[PDB]
Design a protein around this ligand. Structure first.
Ligand SMILES: *[C@@H]1O[C@H](CO)[C@@H](O)[C@H](O)[C@H]1NC(C)=O
Ligand SMILES: *[C@@H]1O[C@H](CO)[C@@H](O)[C@H](O)[C@H]1NC(C)=O
Ligand SMILES: *[C@@H]1O[C@H](CO)[C@@H](O)[C@H](O)[C@H]1NC(C)=O
Ligand SMILES: *[C@@H]1O[C@H](CO)[C@@H](O)[C@H](O)[C@H]1NC(C)=O
Ligand SMILES: [Ca+2]
Ligand SMILES: [Ca+2]
Ligand SMILES: [Ca+2]
Ligand SMILES: [Ca+2]
Ligand SMILES: [Ca+2]
Ligand SMILES: [Ca+2]
Ligand SMILES: [Ca+2]
Ligand SMILES: [Ca+2]
Ligand SMILES: [Ca+2]
Ligand SMILES: [Ca+2]
Ligand SMILES: [Ca+2]
Ligand SMILES: [Ca+2]
Lengths: 533, 272, 265, 272, 265
C-alpha cells in the first residue's frame, strides 16, 4: 500500500516520456480574492506580400500578431490596458487562374476556421497583474463576439477589381493561461485567454472568380473597419501570497523564493522526525495512498498541480532504487536465458538463483547474508512480503512530513521523494519462517536463527535460508529478534501474540503501542530517527 | 515562568515594606508648564524634595519633569522611573487626547511597525490597535471587501478614503477586526505602529486635576471602568495640589506596584 | 504563568533532545544588520539590500525578516542606540583614536542597563556598587565632577567655582563614567545639549553581536582593569573590501545566531 | 589506513627523538630582504649554521630562502622541506594579505582548477573556498538564480558585478554556499582554483615579528583561533630575532610535526 | 582512518573475485595524454581533440575526464614537469642525441622522489646511499663538482680555481647526477638559470606511462649498470604516422590503465 505508491510511480513512469515530448514540442501562506471584472478590446493584423511581374499575382495574404493599447473605466478608476492578439492553426487556401503572368493568382492565403485558435494576451496597471506571480487557480467567464470581414479590393492596374467580401466567425472564451510580455529592461506577467472559433452564416467569396459560398474569416480585412473588437466579463484568480503572522497582507507579492539556489530542507526533516507519533503513524502506514491521495493535501501552485506526480516520477526513475530493480530483472532474465554459457559467479543455495548471487565484496556468512538482504528491499516493492514492509513506514513518514513542511515547491519535491525512498531505513532486516524455525538476516551483516515458541538461538543454516528466502514469502524485522527476546523475557508473551509479531501484524503492533511497551516504542522511535533524511 | 506557586494561610504578616521601598525606589512627577508659571519660583523643586525627605522618600529619589502640553507629552513618552505620577489638566476640547494618553501609559503595549505602501494591515483580536504618534497625523483608511476591492472607497483615489484623524499628535485607531484595510498617512511626520494590548502598567498614576472623570481607557463602550491609579482632584491653585500629592504619596504608591514584565523606558515594547 | 517571580526549575539527564530550532527560529524571528556608510559608498549599488536578503533566503531567513539600518559613524550610532529586533548584528570599524568610544558603545549595547534619571542642579549623587555608573548621551557632553567630603565641602574643587572642577569628558557623543564608589560628587554638564542617566549594569544582552571589521581585539567592556574579558558575541574580521564582509556574515550567520540568545528582559 | 590502533597505559616513555630528528630532517627559514639589508653581511648564513650546529642541527640541514615581500611570497609559496619557519612582518595595510598567507600555508588544501568562460561554479560546505594567485587578481562575482539570471547584477555588463578583490596578488574568496556564481577574472595574469580545506599543515610555523596577534585563520568570525605554530615577537633589530629563533628552535619544532598526508613540493594538493 | 602509520593487514584465500572496477574508475578518475607538437603539425586538424574524446566515450571515459597537454620538446617538457592527474600517458620520440635526456625524463617521472633543497655556496654535500641523487632543472645547467679528502681539501681540483673542477653537465636542461656515495663534494652551478635539488629515490610512480614511439628500448631507469630494467609501464611502438598511434592508444587504453595503478601518496 504505502509501498504500492512507489510501485505505482515506477509503473506509471511511462508517462514521463510523453510529458517530456509535450514539454519539448511546446518549448506560512495566505490567499487573496480576485474574481475581478475586465473588458478586452483587441484587433487583428495582416501581412500582404505581393509578387513582381505585371502586378496580378500575390504570394501571401497571412495573419500577423497585433498589439493594442487603450484605456477604460473599472470601479471608478481609469485603467490603461494593453492587448496582443495572434492566431494559430489556420487553413491556407490558394487561387490560380493559370501560369501566364496576367492570370489572377493568390499562391497562399490564410483563413481561420473551427480548427483554429486565437490567443489574446492582456495586461493592465492594476494590482492583480503584479500580484499574479504565484497562482493557485485561474478561470474566466467572458461573453462572445462575432467578428466579420469587410470589403477588400485587389489593386489590379488593368481591368476590373476582384472584391473580397463576407466571412465571419464567433469567438467564445474557452481557456485561460499565464504568459509574459518582454520589455527592454524588465518583464511583465500577463494573462492570455484562448477563444474558440465557430463559423457563422456570411459566406466569404472572391468576385470575378470561381470562389463563392466559402465560410471562414481571411486576413484581408478581418476588422471590417472596426477600430477594435470588444469582449467583456470576469476573471477568477487565486493567489499564494507568502504572508506571515496574521497581519500585514502584502501587495505586489513582495517576495523572493528558494529559486536563488536541500541543505536546510534536511534540517527541517530532522526537526520534524521525532515529533511524529507512533500509533497514528501505524494507522496511516496501512493505507493505499495512491497518487491522488498522496498529492491532494498539497496546496500546490498552478504549475505544480499540473506536473507534480510526473515531476517526481521523472527523477524517481533515475535513482539507485530503480537502477537496482532493472539490474535485478536483467540478472534474472540473463540467468534464465544464458544457462548454456551460464554465469557461474556464485550460488549460495541449492541451484543458481539471482537472489543468491553474491558479488562486489569490496565473516563470509555475514557478507553472504548482507548481500542477500540488499535484494529483499526489492522483494518489498515486488510484493513477495507479508508484514509492515518497511518502505511502507518510510512512505508514511514521507506523507506525514510533506503535509507539514513549509518548504515544498515544484522543483523541490522531486529528488526529495527519491532521497527519502533511498535514505529512509538504510539498514533493515528481514526473516523467513520454515517449520517453526525463523532465519533472520540484515544488511548490516547480522544473522539470527531462532525458534518461535521458545526463543533460543541456533546455528544459522545458510544454503537453507537462501533456498527459503528465494521463493517463500518474506517478512520484515520491525520486531527484530533482539527486541523480541527482550520482550518475551520482561513482558511475558503469548503464542498468538508472538506468531503475530513474527508475521509483523499491525493489530498486535498497535495493541502493544497502546499498552505502552517501551521495548517496542524504543524500536519504533529508532526506525523514525533513522527515517531522518 | 509557567511553573506554579504554592503557599498557605497560617503564615504571619511580615513587616511593612514601606520605609524601605522608598529608599530602594525612585519617584517622578510629570507637571505642566502652567504649574511652574503659577508658582513663579525656582526652588519649589528643592522644597518638595525636602518635604519628601520628611515623608520618608530620601533626597536623591524624587524627580520632576516639565511637559509643555498634553499632546507634546503624548508624543513618544519616555517613562523610566520605579514610580511615575502624572498631573493632567482638564480640557473638554482634549477629552479624547487625554483618554488616549491614559490608555497608552496606564497599559502595556507590544508594538510592531507598519509599512503602509508595501503591505495592507488588519486586526486579529479586540486588543490589536494602531497607535500613531508625531506632530501632525492625518490618517485615512479604506476597508477592502472579500474580493480586495474598496467599500465606499477606491484603492487609487485617496480622496475617497475615510478620514478618522485630522492633524493630531497621538491617535489610537480601532477598526473592524477581521477585514483588510489600506491606509494613507503622513509617514514623513508620523509613524504608525500595530500594537497589541497586554496586562496593565502598575507603575504610573494619572491624576486628573480638574473636572469629573471622563477617561475611557477601554476602547469598547461597555466597560467604562475606573481603576485605582486613576485619580481626581479639584483645584484652584497648584501648591495645594503638590502638597496633597506629598501628604498622600504613600496611598498613591500603595495604588501602584513595580512592573513585572521587564525593564524599559518607553510606553510600549518593540518586537518588530 | 507567573510574571516577575523566580522559582526552582527541575529536570533530569535522561531526557531525549527535544528539537532542532534553527530554520524555524529563523522563520519566526527578525534579524537586523547595522552597517556603516563607508560600506554602501564602496559598494555603489541601489539593490545590494535586496541582494543580501535573497542570499539570506538560502540560509532560511525569509524576505520580510532581514532588515538593514545604516549609521553614519560610530558616534552617531552611539547617540541613543535604539536596537529593537530579535537578533542584531553590528559592524564596527577600527580606529585607534576611537577605542574608548567603540568600547563604551560595546559596554552599552552588549550589556543590559537599568537607568534612572539624574537632576544635577539639586542632588549630589554617589555610586553604590561596582556596577553603578553614569552614562551620558547627546550631541556633545562635557562632564565635570567635584568629589565632596562628609561635610559637603569640595576636595580639590570649589562648589561655587565650576572652573575648579575636574574634567572627565570633553564634547563626547557618549561617555560612561565610573568614579570612586562611596563618595558624593557634584556634577556640571551641558544639560541643554546632553542628558546623563545613573545606570546599573544587569546581566548581558544576548540579542546583539558586535563585529570589529579591522584591527585586533581591544574592547575593554568591563571598567575594571583586571578582567579585560572577551565574550562569545565579540567578533573580529580582517578586511580589504565590504562585499566579502557581507558574504562572510551571510555564509556564517548560523554561527552568529548560535552565539546569540533571545532576550530575558 | 582505516584499520584501528590499540595500546596501553602501562607502557613506558621511550627516549627522546629530538637530537635524531635534527640529524635526519631539514629546516628552512623564510626571512624578508629587510633583514639582509639591515644586517649588511655575507656570511651570516654560515654564522647561523655554525650556531645551529651546537643546538644539534648539522651543517647541511639548515636553509635560508629569501623573499622580497609578503605578496611576492604569497604568490605560489614553494615550501618543500621537513621543517619550515617563516618570519613575517606586521603592516596594518597587509593584515588581510598575511592572514590569507597564514590560511594558505598553515593549512592543507585540495585544489581543483576552474574554467570560468565555459562553466559556472558554486560552493558546497564551509571549507570550500576559491584561492586566486598571480600578479594582480581583480575578481568580480555575480550570483545567479535557478534559471540563470542575475541577482543585483547583469550577466552582460561586467561593470555591474560585485568586485570582491581589487588588485590583490593572493585572494581567498568565500561566497554564499549553495548558490551558483558567475566570475569575471584576469585569467591572463591570475589563476583561480576551487580548494577544499583539509586538516592543518603541521610542517610550517609562522612568526609575526611585529604587532599584536591579528591572524584569523578560520574565515568564520566566531573562532579566531591561535594555533601552536603561530608565534609573536617584538623587534628593533633582526640579529636579536635570529638569535631568539636559534635559542628557542627546539620549542618551535616541538610545536611543529612532520606531515602525514603525502610528499609534495607545493603548498596545496592538486587532484584536477 | 589512521594516517601516517603502518599497521598489519590480514586477509584470506576464500574470498571471491569482485566485479570489475573498469567502467567505474573510468568515470570517477581522469586521464591526461602528453603528445609532441610534431603530431599536431602533421595532423593540421582543429577538432582532433574532440574526435579523440568522442572515441574515448565508446571505451568508457566521459567527455570531461580526458585532457590533452602539448609539449614542444622532450627537454622543454623535462623542465619542471608538473604532472597532476589520475592516469598520465606520455609519448616520447627516439633520438640518439637525446638518449640520456629522455632516460633522465623517465627516471624522473616514472619514479617518486623525496626532494630537499641545496645551498651550493655554503655547504659541501655527499650521497649517503645508492638512491640519493642530485637532480637539476632549468633552461641551461652547467654543473662542476670537486670531491674532497678527509681534511676538506680537493682531490684533483682546487677549492678556489673553479676551472680545475670536473664537468658532469654541459648546457643541459635536465641532469641527474650520481657521484661517489660517501665523500664530501663541492659544486659550482649557474644558479641564476638552474635549480638543483638533493633527492632520494622511492618506490615507483604507478601513475605515469611512457611510450617510446620510435627505436629500440634504451631507457635505463635505474642508475646502477647491472639491472637495465624494462618495466610494465614502459612501452614501445613503431610508427610512420600519428593518427594510427592515437588510434592504437585509444583502442588499447584499458591495457594501459591495467598496467598502471593510482598513486599511494
Ligand atoms: C519540541 O517538540 C515538542 C513535541 O514534539 C514540543 O512540545 C516543543 O514545544 C518543541 N520545542 C520547541 C522549542 O518548539
Ligand atoms: C516586624 O515588626 C515587629 C513589630 O514592629 C518587630 O518587632 C520585628 O522586629 C519586625 N521584624 C523584623 C525581622 O525586624
Ligand atoms: C634511554 O636513556 C637511558 C638513560 O640515559 C639509557 O640507559 C638507554 O640506553 C636509552 N635508550 C636507548 C635505546 O639507548
Ligand atoms: C558484477 O557482475 C555480476 C554478474 O553479472 C552482477 O551480479 C553484479 O551486480 C556486478 N557488480 C556490480 C557492482 O554491478
Ligand atoms: Ca488624539
Ligand atoms: Ca479593534
Ligand atoms: Ca468614502
Ligand atoms: Ca566617548
Ligand atoms: Ca581642581
Ligand atoms: Ca564605580
Ligand atoms: Ca589578499
Ligand atoms: Ca551590482
Ligand atoms: Ca563558503
Ligand atoms: Ca640531460
Ligand atoms: Ca681537475
Ligand atoms: Ca650515488
Amino acid at each position: 500500500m504505502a509501498s504500492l505508491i512507489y510501485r505505482q510511480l515506477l509503473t506509471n513512469s511511462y508517462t514521463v516520456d510523453l510529458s517530456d515530448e509535450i514539454q519539448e514540442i511546446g518549448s506560512l501562506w495566505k490567499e487573496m480574492q480576485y474574481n475581478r471584472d475586465i473588458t478586452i478590446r483587441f484587433k487583428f493584423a495582416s501581412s500582404i506580400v505581393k509578387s513582381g511581374g505585371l502586378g496580378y499575382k500575390w504570394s501571401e495574404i497571412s495573419f500577423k500578431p497585433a498589439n493594442y493599447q487603450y484605456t477604460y473605466t473599472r470601479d471608478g478608476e481609469e485603467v490603461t490596458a494593453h492587448t496582443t492578439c495572434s492566431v494559430n492553426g489556420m487553413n491556407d487556401f490558394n487561387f490560380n487562374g493559370g501560369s501566364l503572368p496576367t492570370d489572377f493568382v493568390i499562391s497562399r492565403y490564410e483563413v481561420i476556421k473551427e480548427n483554429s485558435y486565437v490567443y489574446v494576451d492582456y495586461w493592465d496597471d492594476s494590482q492583480a497583474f503584479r500580484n499574479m506571480v504565484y497562482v493557485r487557480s485561474l478561470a474566466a467567464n467572458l461573453n462572445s463576439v462575432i467578428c466579420t470581414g469587410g470589403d477588400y479590393s485587389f489593386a489590379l492596374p488593368v481591368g476590373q477589381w476582384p472584391v473580397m467580401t463576407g466571412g465571419a466567425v464567433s469567438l467564445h472564451s474557452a481557456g485561460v493561461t499565464l504568459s509574459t510580455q518582454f520589455t527592454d529592461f524588465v518583464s511583465l506577467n500577463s494573462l492570455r485567454f484562448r477563444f474558440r472559433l465557430t463559423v457563422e452564416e456570411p459566406s466569404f467569396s472572391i468576385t470575378r472568380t470561381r470562389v463563392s459560398r466559402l465560410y471562414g474569416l481571411p486576413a484581408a480585412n478581418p476588422n471590417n473597419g472596426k477600430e477594435y473588437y470588444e469582449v467583456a466579463g470576469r476573471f477568477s484568480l487565486i493567489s499564494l501570497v507568502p504572508s506571515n503572522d496574521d497581519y500585514q497582507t502584502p501587495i505586489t507579492n513582495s517576495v523572493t523564493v528558494r529559486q536563488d539556489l536541500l541543505g536546510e530542507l534536511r534540517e527541517e526533516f530532522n526537526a520534524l522526525s521525532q515529533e511524529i507519533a507512533m500509533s497514528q503513524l501505524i494507522d496511516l502506514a496501512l493505507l493505499p495512498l495512491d497518487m491522488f491521495s498522496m498529492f491532494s493535501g498539497i496546496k500546490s501552485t498552478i504549475d505544480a498541480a499540473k506536473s507534480m506526480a510526473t515531476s517526481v516520477m521523472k527523477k524517481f526513475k533515475k535513482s539507485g532504487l530503480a537502477n537496482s530493480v532493472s539490474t535485478l530483472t536483467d540478472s534474472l532474465s540473463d540467468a534464465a536465458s544464458s544457462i548454456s554459457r551460464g554465469a557461474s559467479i556464485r550460488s549460495v543455495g541449492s541451484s543458481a538463483s539471482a537472489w543468491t548471487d553474491v558479488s562486489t565484496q569490496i565473516s563470509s556468512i555475514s557478507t553472504q547474508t548482507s548481500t542477500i538482504s540488499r535484494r529483499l528491499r526489492l522483494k518489498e516493492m515486488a510484493t513477495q512480503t507479508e508484514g509492515m514492509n518497511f518502505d511502507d513506514i518510510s512512505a508514511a513518514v514521507l506523507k506525514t512530513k510533506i503535509d507539514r513542511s513549509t518548504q515544498i515547491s515544484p522543483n523541490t519535491l522531486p529528488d526529495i521523494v527519491t532521497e527519502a525512498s533511498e535514505k529512509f531505513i538504510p539498514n533493515r532486516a528481514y526473516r523467513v519462517i520454515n517449520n517453526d524455525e525463523v532465519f533472520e538476516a540484515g544488511t548490516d551483516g547480522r544473522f539470527f536463527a531462532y525458534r518461535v515458541e521458545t526463543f533460543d538461538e541456533i546455528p544459522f543454516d545458510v544454503q537453507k535460508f537462501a533456498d527459503l528466502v528465494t521463493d517463500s514469502p518474506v517478512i520484515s524485522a520491525i520486531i527484530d529478534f533482539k527486541t523480541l527476546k527482550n520482550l518475551n523475557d520482561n513482558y511475558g508473551i503469548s503464542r498468538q501474540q508472538a506468531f503475530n509479531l513474527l508475521r509483523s501484524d499491525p493489530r498486535v503492533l498497535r495493541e502493544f503501542i497502546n499498552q505502552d511497551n517501551p521495548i517496542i516504542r524504543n524500536r519504533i522511535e529508532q526506525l523514525i530517527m533513522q527515517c531522518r533524511l | 515562568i509557567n511553573l506554579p506557586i504554592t503557599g498557605s494561610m497560617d503564615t504571619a504578616y511580615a513587616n511593612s515594606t514601606q520605609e524601605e521601598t522608598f529608599l530602594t525606589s525612585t519617584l517622578c512627577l510629570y507637571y505642566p508648564t502652567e504649574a511652574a508659571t503659577e508658582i513663579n519660583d525656582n526652588s519649589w523643586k528643592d522644597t518638595l524634595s525636602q518635604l519628601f525627605l520628611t515623608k520618608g522618600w530620601p533626597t536623591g529619589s524624587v524627580y520632576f519633569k516639565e511637559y509643555t502640553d498634553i499632546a507634546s507629552f503624548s508624543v513618544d513618552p519616555q517613562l523610566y522611573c520605579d514610580y511615575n505620577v502624572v498631573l493632567m489638566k482638564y480640557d473638554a476640547t482634549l477629552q479624547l487626547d487625554m483618554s488616549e494618553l491614559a490608555d497608552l501609559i496606564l497599559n502595556e503595549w507590544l508594538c510592531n511597525p507598519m509599512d503602509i505602501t508595501l503591505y495592507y494591515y488588519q486586526q486579529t483580536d479586540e486588543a490589536n490597535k494602531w497607535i500613531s504618534m508625531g506632530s501632525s497625523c492625518t490618517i485615512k483608511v479604506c476597508p477592502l471587501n472579500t474580493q480586495t476591492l474598496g467599500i465606499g472607497c477606491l484603492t487609487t483615489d485617496t480622496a475617497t478614503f475615510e478620514e478618522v484623524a485630522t492633524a493630531e499628535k497621538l491617535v489610537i485607531t480601532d477598526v473592524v477586526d477581521g477585514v483588510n484595510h489600506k491606509l494613507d498617512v503622513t509617514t514623513a511626520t508620523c509613524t504608525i505602529r500595530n500594537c497589541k494590548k497586554l496586562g496593565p502598567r502598575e507603575n504610573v498614576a494619572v491624576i486628573q486635576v480638574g473636572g469629573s472623570d471622563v477617561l475611557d481607557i477601554t476602547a469598547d463602550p461597555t466597560t467604562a471602568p475606573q481603576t485605582e491609579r486613576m485619580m481626581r482632584i479639584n483645584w484652584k491653585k497648584w501648591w495645594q495640589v503638590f502638597y496633597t500629592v506629598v501628604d498622600y504619596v504613600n496611598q498613591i504608591i500603595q495604588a501602584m506596584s513595580k512592573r513585572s514584565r521587564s525593564l524599559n523606558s518607553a510606553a510600549f515594547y518593540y518586537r518588530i
